[PDB]
Design a protein around this ligand. Structure first.
Ligand SMILES: [Cl-]
Length: 86
C-alpha cells in the first residue's frame, strides 16, 4: 500500500491528454470525470477503457473506476481511455 501514480491517457477525437494522478486510491470517479470535462469542454460524457481482454469497457461509477485502477497496477500503472460525448 498504497497504489502508486497512475497515468490516464485520454483521447477525445484527435486530441489526447495524459493525466498524472498521484494517489489514485485517494481519488473518486467524480473528480476524474470533472477533470476530463474541463479539459475537453464537454458536458455529458461517456468514458471507456481498454481492459486485459483488450475490450473497451464503460466506467460509469466509483466502483467501475476502482476496478479499472486495479488493472492499471497490473499494466505498468497506466490506462488508455476514450471519451465520447452524449
Ligand atoms: Cl455525464
Amino acid at each position: 500500500a498504497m497504489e502508486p501514480q497512475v497515468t490516464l491517457n485520454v483521447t477525445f477525437k484527435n486530441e489526447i491528454q495524459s493525466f498524472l494522478v498521484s494517489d489514485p486510491e485517494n481519488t473518486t470517479w467524480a473528480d476524474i470525470e470533472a477533470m476530463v470535462k474541463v479539459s475537453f469542454d464537454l458536458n455529458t460524457i461517456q468514458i471507456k477503457y481498454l481492459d486485459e481482454e483488450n475490450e473497451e469497457v464503460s466506467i460509469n461509477s466509483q466502483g467501475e473506476y476502482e476496478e479499472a485502477l486495479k488493472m492499471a497496477v497490473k499494466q505498468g500503472n497506466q490506462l488508455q481511455m476514450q471519451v465520447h460525448e452524449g
